[PDB]
Subunit: 485 residues, 3 copies
Amino acid sequence: QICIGYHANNSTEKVDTILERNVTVTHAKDILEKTHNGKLCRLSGIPPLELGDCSIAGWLLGNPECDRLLSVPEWSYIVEKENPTNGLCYPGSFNDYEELKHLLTSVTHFEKIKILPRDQWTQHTTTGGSRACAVSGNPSFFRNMVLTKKGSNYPVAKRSYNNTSGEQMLIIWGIHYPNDDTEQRTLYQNVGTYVSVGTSTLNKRSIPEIATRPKVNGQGGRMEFSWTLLETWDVINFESTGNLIAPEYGFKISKRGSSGIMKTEKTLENCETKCQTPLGAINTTLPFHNIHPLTIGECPKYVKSDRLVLATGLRNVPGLFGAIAGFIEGGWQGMVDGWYGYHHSNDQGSGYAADKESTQKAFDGITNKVNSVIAKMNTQFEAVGKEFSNLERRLENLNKKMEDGFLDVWTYNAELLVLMENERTLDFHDSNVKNLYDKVRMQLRDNVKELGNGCFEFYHKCDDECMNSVKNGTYDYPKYEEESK
Amino acid sequence: QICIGYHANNSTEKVDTILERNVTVTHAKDILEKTHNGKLCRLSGIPPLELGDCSIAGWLLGNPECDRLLSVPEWSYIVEKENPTNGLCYPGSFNDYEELKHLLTSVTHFEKIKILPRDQWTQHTTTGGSRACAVSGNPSFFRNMVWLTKKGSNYPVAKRSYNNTSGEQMLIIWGIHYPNDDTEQRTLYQNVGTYVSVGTSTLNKRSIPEIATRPKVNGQGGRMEFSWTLLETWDVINFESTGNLIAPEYGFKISKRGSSGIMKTEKTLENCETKCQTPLGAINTTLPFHNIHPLTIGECPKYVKSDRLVLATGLRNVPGLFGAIAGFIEGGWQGMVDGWYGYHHSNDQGSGYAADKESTQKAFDGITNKVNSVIAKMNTQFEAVGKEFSNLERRLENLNKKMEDGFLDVWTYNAELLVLMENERTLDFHDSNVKNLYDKVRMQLRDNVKELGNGCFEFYHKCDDECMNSVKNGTYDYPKYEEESK
Amino acid sequence: QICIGYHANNSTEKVDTILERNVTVTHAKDILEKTHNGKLCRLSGIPPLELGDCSIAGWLLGNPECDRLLSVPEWSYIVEKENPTNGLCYPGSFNDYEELKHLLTSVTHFEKIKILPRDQWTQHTTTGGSRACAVSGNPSFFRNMVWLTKKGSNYPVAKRSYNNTSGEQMLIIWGIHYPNDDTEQRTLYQNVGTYVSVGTSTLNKRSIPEIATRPKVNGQGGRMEFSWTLLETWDVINFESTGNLIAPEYGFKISKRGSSGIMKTEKTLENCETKCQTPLGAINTTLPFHNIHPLTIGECPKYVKSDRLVLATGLRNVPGLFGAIAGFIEGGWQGMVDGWYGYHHSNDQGSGYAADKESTQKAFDGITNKVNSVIAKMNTQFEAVGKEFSNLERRLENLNKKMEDGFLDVWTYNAELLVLMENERTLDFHDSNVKNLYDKVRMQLRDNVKELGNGCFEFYHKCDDECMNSVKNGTYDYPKYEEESK
């Protein structure tokens, strides 16, 4: 007597197929990454620029509260809080702010630099400040910026700078808008004033826009800031009959690519990732994750699913080809060196001897299958999160529509892929078993009786060198023309 | 004798698989929604704002042709004609108009409030009108706006402000008048160095009028340029003008849960209901895909180019991979009406169609799950689709088109091929079930019967309607029947 | 002795499947397109507008370095160098430049009309040139524009209008001069508080000169800022200026079906044809995928990040899921070469390879259908891909990149996996056909023959060449042969 059977264990893994729900399997691999390390990490060896709770504006202008900052020279992304507490301490706006932020997203090198020393505004006053930028508790001001009437005269202010730093330079300036026509004279004299900033490509003229306005930080005045990139060996010319907030500093900047701003309170911790999320770093080979939509790095595809379990083992019992949970009605707790095997009753012994020849071919197959799903996923570096001003609602909605479209696609394809490939894994094991059965039947024939539950009853004395020959697929039919039938 | 077979009926239902086109199948399920109710509907309980043929601009400003309009306080989308006829009766433009429309697209609450009553403009003339906005047939003007003009030979500094104590964020619109020429200016406003000033916490604006000759539109050379802002709560707006100010009299309390879309159509609201509206009519369906119209609003099936997505659910109809169906069992049985697979038996007593409950149920279950899988894994958030762009945003509109199309192509391909591949396996599943049933009998009878030819066993012994039973229900006893009429 | 067999050959063609790698297969089809004809072509009958090394701005304005440019009236897409040498020869900017280029990407129809002859500017000087725009080697200027300057010590109000009676929509470009300083302003235009004012029915613009010191570009400190409009049919455009106006002489009649793209390339038009163009060359193909280059224009296969997409069409080549191929029948027969599956017979006469036409044909049909399903379900509208963004639209450009990459990821994955999955199934399909063939023979014989093992039956009786043909072609009486050597 020699039986064919398959492995069963005490596993409680459930997988789903297109055809069945909650099916207990023998072994399974989840292909959805759901763990992060809870740390904010460096991206490929380079840290993020951490803005504490300053805004980029607050930092670049030199809000006094951003004094204790610590500017690294490199950074691979930016950490900003959702709503930072120290931005424009003096009330105002920042032209093309979102574009400036996108630019400074990632930097190869970034160095502040003095380019228009304040002391050389010989003909103007340079010490104007405000209680809005107060330092317990005197008027102060953006530390990176500087002009008001000297005596009762505001002459044309006209300085320029040639970028000899050998790097592209960021440069910011501003224009002030007083409360009313008097404040405008008490500060600048003349009333038809302008601010002129020009480079080889930049060319801009601003005039004061005066309106009655509620106080913000105790101020009715406003300041509007603009910025340009000054190419190397180019010069920038300032000219103003009043209202100019001048830079004292510029910033050298080089860029390789781009990146993103990550909203979070977390702090740099000193580990390493190829992939960051506002929850923690992700370290995975898997093609999918459900940690958080707003990643930066080379990430697994984000999916709405919360389980993607591939079956790797076979159905687990105490399908398509009629053997497993079929004509062979149960699994063997006892066979534990393979997936499919033999069980002999002999004069000598009995008799669990798993089939290596075939269990092997299955390990490879199911190995290849899992690796196909994982290894085909192309993953470039992306930043996901983005920024839009409140007059860019449509454009923000376009972006949401796009991210949501891909999310639906990947979720659906990942769910259906798992379902289909599970139907096919189980049928695979079922056919492996049916084929082992048929490989024995096609050897024995007359020499054995088929019982019905996967058994062969031997018509002739068989012994250990006999089975050990069926197993190895080398049993000679001639040698046993006993016909006890 | 006992025989194994499968169900057949009078179906003409055709499906396609990866391998064969035009296969006749026993039962099937179209998974493509193709029909609508042709009505224009209320979306999850909430009506659309219906503009008739005003534009949002005309409506907000109070174009007098928009008088009959019927304003509602809630609304879930907007119905506008492609080319509305009553917009800005006095010619002009609306700054960031598309952003303003997008804003108004969906609203949890919306209420007009009188914030700057006309009467309190004591020092100016208020009855200022125009033949461009005439009310049969006297000059009028937008009913929500105030055209400040000189009173006597004077136009003093016009200076008013409003603190938003309304409890909600408030939309405010104002305008500045661009006259046709110096004489229109003087007769309207006396002064000449004029300007309009508007300031809030975050808003800061000073506009100066541009006198200049322009072609006439609705008989006007002048132009009016409108701007808007959202006034936050407990914030104040300050207006100051020496002329050319078109003042609001009203502001709009607005609250927004989320965002929606403007649906361009001729149809009108009709008192039905949906989770999904299109310009042709509403859609009510579980199906994962539709082909009705790309510009839907709400929770909708995926839109595909395809116009047939039919899932085989029954078997190949014969009045495969495993070789039973249309194979070694040559055809199906019209006779068997209560199951997918079963037995034919020939007895000294009777004959003889008995359905195989057990395995027919395995299949009713599997195929139920397969359909539910295809349908229920489909993630359907609420979306708007339709989008608005100015004539100077062609590239942006084209970006959106490239995106909507990219997705159309993806969903189309994936659904078409999903259907094809899952059809090939559905058939082969039924095939497998029939072959395993045949084998369950063969392994059970062994010598006691002869394998006949086409799914048939001839017993080498007498078998009554009790013995048959043991076969059909798996309990056949071999040992008992050692008759070898062999 | 009858034997069931299957085709084998000298093919070294390799495929991958979900389950195995580097499987040698009998025949294969690549469904990934990678050849291009290296030519730059015309698109469905219509040529590209070829800019040489001008920029569109340069061309429209009439840069002297574009005189010899050859303008067709129609064009279907534009060819520009990634970086042209001849644009604004006199320094400045072009408002809404990317919008303009996108509008001119593809055109019906496009001719240049003379709307405002220079000599009708009688109160002004018209010949103003510049060294920046020089013609070997005197001072010239954009051939299509007029630089209005003072006559003697006077600059009267410059004021003309033009009614678009051309019958087509009309493109019109104007400019404003930004001088280096007050004295340059005065020697050119006399007056100081100048403005340029342009108005149509819908356009309404007023510019003031920005006099200020700038670095020198092309030897010039001044700048010119150009703007553009589309003048609708029968509408008029008013020009009014007190100085600094760069007037147009010409306007461009324009008509458009739809939109296209700009192709950045060095190549030049080469007199052929495509439905699909890339910067490396044209593509002629039926295949659904290509990996030639992402920036295509026309109706194109899907661009994939992969470089082999090989579908098995033939069978596992042996010099499966159903146990037959490289299973209980261990080798393929080099011998039989008129079918995929068939028989070998041990006889007294011949012996012996006989194809099974009927089964082989049902497999050619199936696999032919599989390949066609994969290729023919791929929908391809016409798209341009390549896009254009000013350097203050980095966010918007990144949005476009996140979009193209996203589709690229989706298509590459689905395609790679499609191929792998359909390959595992193609192989199992052949395996099943062999197996079923074998089982067709077995269920026919029975008692009559001996199941040997490697797919062979040993006969219990004489079977002469004509007996065989009853097995092979599936009509063979069992009755006849009661000869029991057993």
